Amino acid sequence: MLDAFSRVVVNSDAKAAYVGGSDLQALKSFIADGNKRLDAVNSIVSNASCMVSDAVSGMICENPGLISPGGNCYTNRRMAACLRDGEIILRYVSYALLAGDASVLEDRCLNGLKETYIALGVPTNSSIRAVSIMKAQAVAFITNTATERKMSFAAGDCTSLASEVASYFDRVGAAIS
Amino acid sequence: MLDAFSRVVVNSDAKAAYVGGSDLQALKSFIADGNKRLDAVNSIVSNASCMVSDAVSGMICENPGLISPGGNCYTNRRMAACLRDGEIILRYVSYALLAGDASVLEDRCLNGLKETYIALGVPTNSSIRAVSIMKAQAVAFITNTATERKMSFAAGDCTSLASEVASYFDRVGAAIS
Amino acid sequence: MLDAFSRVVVNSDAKAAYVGGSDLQALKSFIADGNKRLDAVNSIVSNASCMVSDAVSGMICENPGLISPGGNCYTNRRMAACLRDGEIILRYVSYALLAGDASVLEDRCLNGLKETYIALGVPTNSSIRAVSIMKAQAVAFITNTATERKMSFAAGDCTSLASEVASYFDRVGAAIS
Amino acid sequence: WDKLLNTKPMKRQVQPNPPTNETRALNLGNTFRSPAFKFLGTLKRSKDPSGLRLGFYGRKADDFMARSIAMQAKASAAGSGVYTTQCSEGASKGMAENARTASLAKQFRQAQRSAREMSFDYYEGRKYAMKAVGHICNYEEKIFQQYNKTAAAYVMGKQETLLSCDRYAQPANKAEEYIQKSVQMQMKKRSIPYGVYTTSCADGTVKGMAENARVAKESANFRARQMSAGAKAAARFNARRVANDWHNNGCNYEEKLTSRFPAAASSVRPTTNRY
Amino acid sequence: LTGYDSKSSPNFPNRAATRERRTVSFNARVARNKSQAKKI
Amino acid sequence: MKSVITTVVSAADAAGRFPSNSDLESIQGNIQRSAARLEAAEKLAGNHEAVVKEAGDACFAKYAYLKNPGEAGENQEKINKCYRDVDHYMRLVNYCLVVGGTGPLDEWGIAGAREVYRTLNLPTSAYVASIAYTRDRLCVPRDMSAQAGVEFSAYLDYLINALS
Amino acid sequence: MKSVITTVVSAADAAGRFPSNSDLESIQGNIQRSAARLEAAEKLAGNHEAVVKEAGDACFAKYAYLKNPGEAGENQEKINKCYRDVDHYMRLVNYCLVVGGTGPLDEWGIAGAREVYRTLNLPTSAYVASIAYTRDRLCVPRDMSAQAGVEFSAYLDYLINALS
Amino acid sequence: MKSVITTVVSAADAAGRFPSNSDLESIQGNIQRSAARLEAAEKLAGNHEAVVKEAGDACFAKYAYLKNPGEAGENQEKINKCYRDVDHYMRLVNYCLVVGGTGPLDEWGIAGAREVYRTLNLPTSAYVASIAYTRDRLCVPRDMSAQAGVEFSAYLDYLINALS
Numbered sequence A, B, C: 001m002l003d004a005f006s007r008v009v010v011n012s013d014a015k016a017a018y019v020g021g022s023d024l025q026a027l028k029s030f031i032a033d034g035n036k037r038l039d040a041v042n043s044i045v046s047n048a049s050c051m052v053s054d055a056v057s058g059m060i061c062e063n064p065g066l067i068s069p070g071g072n073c074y075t076n077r078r079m080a081a082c083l084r085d086g087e088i089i090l091r092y093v094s095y096a097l098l099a100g101d102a103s104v105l106e107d108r109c110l111n112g113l114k115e116t117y118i119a120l121g122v123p124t125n126s127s128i129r130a131v132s133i134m135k136a137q138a139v140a141f142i143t144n145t146a147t148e149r150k151m152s153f154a155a156g157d158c159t160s161l162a163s164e165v166a167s168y169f170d171r172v173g174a175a176i177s
Numbered sequence D: 001w002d003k004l005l006n007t008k009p010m011k012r013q014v015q016p017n018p019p020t021n022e023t024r025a026l027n028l029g030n031t032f033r034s035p036a037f038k039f040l041g042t043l044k045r046s047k048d049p050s051g052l053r054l055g056f057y058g059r060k061a062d063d064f065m066a067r068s069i070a071m072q073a074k075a076s077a078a079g080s081g082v083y084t085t086q087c088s089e090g091a092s093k094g095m096a097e098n099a100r101t102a103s104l105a106k107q108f109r110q111a112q113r114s115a116r117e118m119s120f121d122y123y124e125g126r127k128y129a130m131k132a133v134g135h136i137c138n139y140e141e142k143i144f145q146q147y148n149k150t151a152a153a154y155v156m157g158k159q160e161t162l163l164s165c166d167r168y169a170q171p172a173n174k175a176e177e178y179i180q181k182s183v184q185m186q187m188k189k190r191s192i193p194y195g196v197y198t199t200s201c202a203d204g205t206v207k208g209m210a211e212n213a214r215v216a217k218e219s220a221n222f223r224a225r226q227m228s229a230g231a232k233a234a235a236r237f238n239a240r241r242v243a244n245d246w247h248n249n250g251c252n253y254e255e256k257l258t259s260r261f262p263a264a265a266s267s268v269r270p271t272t273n274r275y
Numbered sequence E: 001l002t003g004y005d006s007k008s009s010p011n012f013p014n015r016a017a018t019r020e021r022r023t024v025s026f027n028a029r030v031a032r033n034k035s036q037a038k039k040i
Numbered sequence F, G, H: 001m002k003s004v005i006t007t008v009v010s011a012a013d014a015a016g017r018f019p020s021n022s023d024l025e026s027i028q029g030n031i032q033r034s035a036a037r038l039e040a041a042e043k044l045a046g047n048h049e050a051v052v053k054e055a056g057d058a059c060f061a062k063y064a065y066l067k068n069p070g071e072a073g074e075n076q077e078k079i080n081k082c083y084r085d086v087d088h089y090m091r092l093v094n095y096c097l098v099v100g101g102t103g104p105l106d107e108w109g110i111a112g113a114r115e116v117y118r119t120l121n122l123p124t125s126a127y128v129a130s131i132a133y134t135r136d137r138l139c140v141p142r143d144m145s146a147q148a149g150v151e152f153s154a155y156l157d158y159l160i161n162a163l164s
């Protein structure tokens, strides 16, 4: 894969050149947030048992065709599948935020699942809808703007990592169209 | 700047209306509660040096992340500048509780108040926590439900003024979030 | 405003660390070259008129684009602003080479510099050309390898300050670009 | 031990000496910032401008009317068509192109102010514009609290076409000029708060404008006592018109210090412009 | 959590290394589950 | 605006200071004489069409020169705008009996009145004298209460005073 | 000074303006509650030797550390000056019941109190708490009238507020 | 900040002037006595847990009144914050032996100390006297060198001087 440091290698390899003084204001820029980049990667893997449980339950309680009899989450096999089947996507962005780039997010999971969810049944309505409930809750934890649990951190701005992180989340979120 | 005797006229000047006795009973209720508003606002400024000291101690009681070095609010000039900004908002809401109208709240601080703070690097989640303490002690002093401090009053309902101060700090709190 | 004896505090004060002899050998090597720093920087202010002589002249040696009327820098008041601007960077890098730290540059001239040059119509490629002539003559002047001008010296190693001045001017060149 | 279907929620027991058990509870601890949604083509993070940031259209509006506020107030200085002698901006030798580089340094050093003093001067000038106008309007402060250059060109502009500034009101005796000197020392102490000299009384960049700034004021110090006999007599009544009413309210001692010493109360300069 | 872990199930596309292999087991090792992913 | 709220909550902000009991005292004088102040307001609300017409040609009796062409009252279209002009003064004086001070007068209808009228060739001498007709036009124990006319009459001669 | 006279005749001079009816209204609130304000003044004039002694060793009960040498209360000569010090605070609060605002407090006994005391190694925490003893030390329908204690008690917690 | 770099490179900018030999001379006095200044820094880095505990109850011996409820030392949670408070003073004085002047003291831990403490009802008299315990607590040929204590002791009585 490529991290945020290996992004500036390969296009500067493509220019047949050196890592010069042009990208020094980007490879000092990721040096500075690495206190709060590592503070933000802890905030998703801490709550991720509550996060994927909230993501399926909010999807089901507003779309009751998933608890249709003979449906996609009707049996206990098909309900325990989707608790894992949307959790690995939550796991794969937890490595992608830490690397500072979503280069891992294409060659590990996004190469295939657009034509694989329909290949055994899983439709396009609720799998796009399962990402967006995780998306507005992932921005709440890193900004300490949840409703029920307030994490004790330092003081500072977090919109810069929110426009980062959303990218990973949503990129897999779409994908499926 | 503007008050409840002037909020009633400024809409009527957009329609060039003579003021009559169709709206003065709102002001007859306002001139009814002349001493009742005055028996509220003396109890605010009686103990408001204790109110500033109660708020930013209890805001530090919930969060020691400021007092940590490298934090926003940890050293001695910084706390004196914190005790500066902690008073100046309590100074302003007492003017609007005197006015019966929060026009004087808006123009004098809230014009761009929110993101001078992130132009200074000041955490805005800590600001809404501290003024929520200043919300909570203020209603206990315009009632008689403090811990020890029972001022002399004559009895009766004062919840209409308690809803008026309830419409005040959140107008600041939405203007800083 | 800030020096190398106070660069070494704001890391340790941020982690609340009392400075001990684990890092005082960096200042012991910095109080080693105390007179050696003065022996370098006496040789730049001695011919400090001669370095603003050779720079803008070598700038108009390489570029006859500015000297054309209708160009930016052809005329003498505009060249007076130029030869104001050329010595003021020379006036300020002497302070940082005195201090052993580049923070006295970093707020007093680099704050808001390049966008004023595109608010005025200053071509910035000529600026990094002219400071490179200033960088090229200063390393000869702190050493003993000029053409005619040789001062008396105690001999030895002077290249650690030569790496310091070569890391100082291009930081100014990174600001105007 | 054993339950019943009866209703005794109400009721108590009285045996509540209950100072023997103390209990509490909690809940809280949850800030919230409004964040945007949809990855395709977007993601925004908060940024530090350290300025007004109230619109690009508002920012380019703001310097135009304060230029018009200054040109309003240049037209009260030249009400009668004189470039009046209180405004001086040079020396004997020409050097106002050299004092251009003094004032464009002040145009530049106020631009490269740091984030504390860029933001402090936005709010102290807003309440000083309330102090600058005498009347209380629906209009004037409703420019002067959104816009700050307009507030800054009003506390400079209106106050320079009265004669309560520095170096314009002449003291009578040795006693008035000495406390005129001593209140200037605290205005040094304001702009030099500690062992660092500030960036903002720098008044010069080159060797030519170093001593040009010294001989500029000494010609302007003479042009206080040169120009008139009644406008400088109107200065000593004007010096109480800035100090008594919006600088030392409540202190009678600091009020009769103006009316006994107007020229000493005229370089008190409480408009904190860091000079 | 579902089990002890949540790892990648081997019935996904691109579940192999596929680096310096034979011709008969390159296009068997690449394109693992294209039997229904395209045919529908 | 202009009231006692514009005095004491602004001066405490101009001192950077609490609402101390100097500020809490100043509004008590509103309360004991708002009943004195606010039966005067419904008089000129009850006579908002009655005394506009009686003031115009009382002014145009003593200013009868206007009806020639080339002046301020050359047609009835001017006089249709002229009863609008005295009533727009009369709207604001009604509102100053409500806010206490002369709040709606100065920031809306007084400041810069001496940059408008004779530039539009409107005579300012007829403007104060139409108002000075209505200034003495009162009868304090008969029209209103005796505690109501002294707020009314002090605002009308102020209108001649503010044009000075 | 500090009163409603210091508000409105100074703001009309700060506007360069007449004493209009905004200024004439603000002093009416003096008149209706000077009788409320000025039976409180002869209480602490009647108790000008009574409650100075009861506040000193109520303070020195909760500040009993002072009697060692090298501190603020090392001898009776300090305590002979200490009952002078609370009474000099107590003189001014009596005068602020007369002028209306806190006139004699700020320009005489409040401003620059935070440049004096611990420089003279006098504890400021005992200064507010001697006053906060007397702040709650009231009984509004029994000592004075009910309209008299709310001017008294609002000035005493102000003395802790002005030292903040 | 506050050092000799804050004097001469700022005054040459305040004159708009070169770093002339007045500015080049002023830093030579750093070089000949940095060895005098910087064996004092590792003493209170070596005793950064040793002399914080010996100064707290030396202060709380002569200030033993704090342990009542309603004051600055009502529980151990205050005393757990109180050894943080003397150490945060003690951090900065260590750093002023490195920068030369009192650089980290004034802009971080000195300015506006007289707007905080008794407002939080913290006694300032105990703050200087905890420091004045440590001011004389030295022994110049025995703990450190004789060239090291005169930078140390001149900063500690400055802490009483800067609170004045």
Ligand SMILES: *C(=C)C1=C(C)[C@@H](Cc2[nH]c(/C=C3N=C(/C=C4\NC(=O)[C@H](C)[C@H]4CC)C(C)=C\3CCC(=O)O)c(CCC(=O)O)c2C)NC1=O
Pocket (backbone or CB within 6 Å): B047, B050, B051, B053, B054, B055, B057, B058, B059, B061, B062, B132, B133, B136, B137, B138, B140, B141, B145, B146, B147, B148, B149
């Ligand atoms: C830290 C662990 C911590 C604190 C410090 C303390 C602060 C605190 N106080 C409240 C609630 C109130 N505080 C009030 C203030 C005072 N009460 C008084 O009697 C005096 C005059 C003054 C103290 C100087 C008041 C009136 C209240 C309201 C309830 C009450 O009567 O106690 C909070 C909670 C704020 C909220 O409700 O959101 C905090 C944090 N408490 C601590 O836990």
Ligand SMILES: *CCC1=C(C)C(=O)N[C@H]1Cc1[nH]c(/C=C2\N=C(C[C@H]3NC(=O)C(CC)=C3C)C(C)=C2CCC(=O)O)c(CCC(=O)O)c1C
Pocket (backbone or CB within 6 Å): D074, D077, D078, D083, D084, D086, D087, D088, D089, D094, D096, D097, D099, D100, D101, D103, D104
């Ligand atoms: C208080 C009087 C006043 C008015 C009105 C005004 O506009 N400015 C002041 C004084 C003043 N100064 C000058 C003349 C000149 N000033 C300069 C320097 C300009 N160049 C600059 O970069 C700046 C900073 C923005 C300034 C001011 C120059 C070059 C002159 C030329 C006169 C000369 O000796 O040739 C004047 C006179 C002309 C004018 O209308 O501005 C006044 C009145």
Ligand SMILES: *[C@@H](C)[C@H]1/C(=C/C2=NC(=C\c3[nH]c(C[C@H]4NC(=O)C(C=C)=C4C)c(C)c3CCC(=O)O)/C(CCC(=O)O)=C2C)NC(=O)[C@@H]1C
Pocket (backbone or CB within 6 Å): C034, C035, C036, C038, C039, C040, C042, C142, C143, C144, C153, C154, C155, C156, C157, C158, C161, H024, H025, H028
């Ligand atoms: C490389 C940049 C230079 C160079 C530097 C050296 N200087 C050496 C010694 C030295 N320089 C001075 C003068 C200095 N002290 C002052 O007080 C002032 C001004 C007021 C100045 C300019 C002195 C006094 C000394 C001797 C003291 C010392 O540093 O030990 C030096 C050798 C050190 C030594 O001899 O032990 C070097 C290498 N010398 C060069 O040749 C290049 C050009």
Ligand SMILES: *[C@@H](C)[C@H]1/C(=C/C2=NC(=C\c3[nH]c(C[C@H]4NC(=O)C(C=C)=C4C)c(C)c3CCC(=O)O)/C(CCC(=O)O)=C2C)NC(=O)[C@@H]1C
Pocket (backbone or CB within 6 Å): D065, D068, D069, D072, D073, D135, D136, D137, D138, D139, D140, D143, F001, F106, F107, F108, F110, F111
């Ligand atoms: C607020 C409307 C007050 C009021 C104030 C008065 N202002 C007077 C003059 C004045 N007003 C301004 C602000 C405004 N005029 C402008 O030209 C511009 C911008 C280009 C603005 C924002 C200025 C700058 C000045 C001085 C120069 C001038 O006259 O334009 C004024 C006349 C006397 C005086 O100069 O003070 C008054 C009375 N008027 C009111 O009645 C309400 C209460």
Ligand SMILES: *[C@@H](C)[C@H]1/C(=C/C2=NC(=C\c3[nH]c(C[C@H]4NC(=O)C(C=C)=C4C)c(C)c3CCC(=O)O)/C(CCC(=O)O)=C2C)NC(=O)[C@@H]1C
Pocket (backbone or CB within 6 Å): D179, D183, D186, D243, D247, D248, D249, D250, D251, D252, D253, D254, D257, D258, D264, D265, D268, D270, G106, G107, G108, G110, G111, G112
């Ligand atoms: C009067 C008792 C006030 C009050 C006064 C304070 N002023 C403080 C500093 C200060 N005050 C002035 C204005 C005044 N002081 C003078 O010496 C002169 C002229 C001779 C005047 C007109 C100035 C200019 C300054 C800054 C420096 C200086 O003292 O001269 C002050 C200290 C705290 C502060 O910096 O503000 C006080 C306490 N403060 C009050 O509470 C009453 C109303």
Ligand SMILES: *[C@H](C)C1=C(C)C(=O)N[C@H]1Cc1[nH]c(/C=C2\N=C(C[C@H]3NC(=O)C(CC)=C3C)C(C)=C2CCC(=O)O)c(CCC(=O)O)c1C
Pocket (backbone or CB within 6 Å): D188, D191, D192, D197, D201, D202, D203, D210, D211, D212, D213, D214, D215, D217, D218, D275, H011, H014, H015, H017
């Ligand atoms: C900033 C507010 C200042 C303080 C404090 C101060 O005393 N002067 C301000 C800036 C400043 N200037 C110097 C040195 C010079 N300043 C000059 C201009 C001044 N000289 C004058 O005659 C006048 C009018 C009275 C002024 C403002 C000149 C010329 C010099 C000297 C240049 C030279 O010949 O070397 C200093 C440093 C003072 C020192 O001696 O260290 C400061 C802080």
Ligand SMILES: *[C@H](C)[C@H]1/C(=C/C2=NC(=C\c3[nH]c(C[C@H]4NC(=O)C(C=C)=C4C)c(C)c3CCC(=O)O)/C(CCC(=O)O)=C2C)NC(=O)[C@@H]1C
Pocket (backbone or CB within 6 Å): B034, B035, B036, B037, B038, B039, B040, B042, B141, B142, B143, B144, B153, B154, B155, B156, B157, B158, B161, F024, F025, F028, G033, G150
């Ligand atoms: C609710 C916020 C309060 C409360 C309000 C009441 N106040 C009542 C009567 C009252 N208060 C004052 C004093 C007031 N007027 C002043 O001029 C000044 C200071 C300058 C102050 C503090 C007076 C004079 C009166 C009596 C006149 C009146 O309002 O009728 C009151 C009883 C009303 C009545 O008896 O009709 C109430 C309910 N009282 C409370 O208990 C809470 C805390």
Ligand SMILES: *[C@H](C)[C@H]1/C(=C/C2=NC(=C\c3[nH]c(C[C@H]4NC(=O)C(C=C)=C4C)c(C)c3CCC(=O)O)/C(CCC(=O)O)=C2C)NC(=O)[C@@H]1C
Pocket (backbone or CB within 6 Å): C056, C072, C073, C077, C078, C079, C081, C082, C083, C084, C085, C086, C088, C108, C109, C113, C120, C122, C123, C124, C126, C127, C130, D101, D104, D105, D108, D205
């Ligand atoms: C000429 C060979 C240079 C060049 C110079 C220019 N500088 C111009 C304006 C300017 N630059 C600054 C930044 C610098 N100069 C200072 O005086 C200060 C300190 C105050 C600093 C940091 C400022 C502040 C200004 C405006 C005031 C001034 O002129 O000093 C400028 C524009 C003049 C014109 O209109 O022609 C020029 C040409 N630009 C070049 O391309 C070469 C490298």
Ligand SMILES: *[C@H](C)[C@H]1/C(=C/C2=NC(=C\c3[nH]c(C[C@H]4NC(=O)C(C=C)=C4C)c(C)c3CCC(=O)O)/C(CCC(=O)O)=C2C)NC(=O)[C@@H]1C
Pocket (backbone or CB within 6 Å): F056, F059, F066, F072, F073, F078, F079, F081, F082, F083, F084, F085, F086, F088, F089, F108, F109, F116, F120, F122, F123, F126, F127, F130
């Ligand atoms: C008739 C009895 C009068 C007279 C009246 C005229 N006024 C004219 C224009 C005008 N009047 C005012 C002042 C007034 N109008 C307002 O809207 C307000 C405030 C709400 C006030 C105090 C203004 C500002 C203007 C100009 C704008 C406008 O037309 O409203 C007018 C028309 C003049 C013309 O168009 O040539 C007339 C006839 N004129 C008199 O001489 C007698 C005394």
Ligand SMILES: *[C@H](C)[C@H]1/C(=C/C2=NC(=C\c3[nH]c(C[C@H]4NC(=O)C(C=C)=C4C)c(C)c3CCC(=O)O)/C(CCC(=O)O)=C2C)NC(=O)[C@@H]1C
Pocket (backbone or CB within 6 Å): G056, G059, G066, G072, G073, G078, G079, G081, G082, G083, G084, G085, G086, G088, G089, G108, G109, G116, G120, G122, G123, G126, G127, G130
């Ligand atoms: C005893 C119950 C106190 C205490 C009192 C002391 N105050 C001392 C000096 C002092 N006090 C003040 C404030 C007060 N005195 C006044 O004259 C006025 C205003 C009219 C006020 C508010 C001042 C200004 C001074 C210094 C000048 C003077 O002596 O009057 C003092 C003597 C200290 C000494 O000489 O060392 C004492 C003992 N001290 C305490 O700790 C308790 C609480």
Ligand SMILES: *[C@H](C)[C@H]1/C(=C/C2=NC(=C\c3[nH]c(C[C@H]4NC(=O)C(C=C)=C4C)c(C)c3CCC(=O)O)/C(CCC(=O)O)=C2C)NC(=O)[C@@H]1C
Pocket (backbone or CB within 6 Å): B057, B060, B067, B074, B075, B076, B079, H056, H059, H066, H072, H073, H078, H079, H081, H082, H083, H084, H085, H086, H088, H089, H108, H109, H116, H120, H122, H123, H126, H127, H130
């Ligand atoms: C114990 C030996 C002391 C004492 C200490 C207390 N200080 C309290 C709060 C406090 N202290 C300071 C000054 C100090 N703390 C710092 O962080 C820095 C600079 C880095 C310094 C110089 C400040 C600024 C504060 C307020 C913010 C904070 O809590 O850090 C304190 C708690 C008071 C309370 O919460 O009520 C205590 C107990 N107090 C004493 O009386 C003895 C002498």
Ligand SMILES: *[C@H](C)[C@H]1/C(=C\C2=NC(=C/c3[nH]c(C[C@H]4NC(=O)C(C=C)=C4C)c(C)c3CCC(=O)O)/C(CCC(=O)O)=C2C)NC(=O)[C@@H]1C
Pocket (backbone or CB within 6 Å): F043, F044, F046, F047, F050, F051, F137, F138, F139, F140, F142, F143
């Ligand atoms: C007091 C002036 C004298 C006495 C009798 C008069 N009463 C008059 C009454 C009158 N006034 C008006 C205009 C009136 N309405 C208003 O709204 C206002 C101002 C707010 C005013 C002044 C009108 C239309 C009348 C007639 C109908 C009525 O009586 O209400 C008056 C004026 C002449 C007239 O029209 O009648 C006089 C004279 N009695 C005395 O003792 C006083 C000398």
Ligand SMILES: *[C@H](C)[C@H]1/C(=C\C2=NC(=C/c3[nH]c(C[C@H]4NC(=O)C(C=C)=C4C)c(C)c3CCC(=O)O)/C(CCC(=O)O)=C2C)NC(=O)[C@@H]1C
Pocket (backbone or CB within 6 Å): G043, G044, G046, G047, G050, G051, G137, G138, G139, G140, G142, G143
């Ligand atoms: C109201 C506090 C409670 C009740 C009875 C009490 N009366 C007390 C009276 C008392 N007060 C003082 C000091 C007094 N004199 C002053 O000038 C001032 C302030 C301006 C004050 C507070 C003195 C010397 C006495 C005793 C003689 C007297 O009765 O006048 C009091 C305090 C304890 C005492 O000394 O008696 C209480 C308690 N009754 C109630 O219902 C209230 C709870």
Ligand SMILES: *[C@H](C)[C@H]1/C(=C\C2=NC(=C/c3[nH]c(C[C@H]4NC(=O)C(C=C)=C4C)c(C)c3CCC(=O)O)/C(CCC(=O)O)=C2C)NC(=O)[C@@H]1C
Pocket (backbone or CB within 6 Å): H043, H044, H046, H047, H050, H051, H137, H138, H139, H140, H142, H143
């Ligand atoms: C000089 C004060 C007298 C003599 C002997 C004493 N030595 C003492 C030593 C001592 N000092 C401390 C605290 C110390 N550590 C620090 O880091 C700092 C400040 C930066 C200080 C002051 C400690 C813990 C000791 C004991 C262990 C040791 O000896 O190092 C001392 C104080 C009492 C004591 O605890 O022993 C005295 C007295 N000899 C003389 O001639 C001087 C009169």
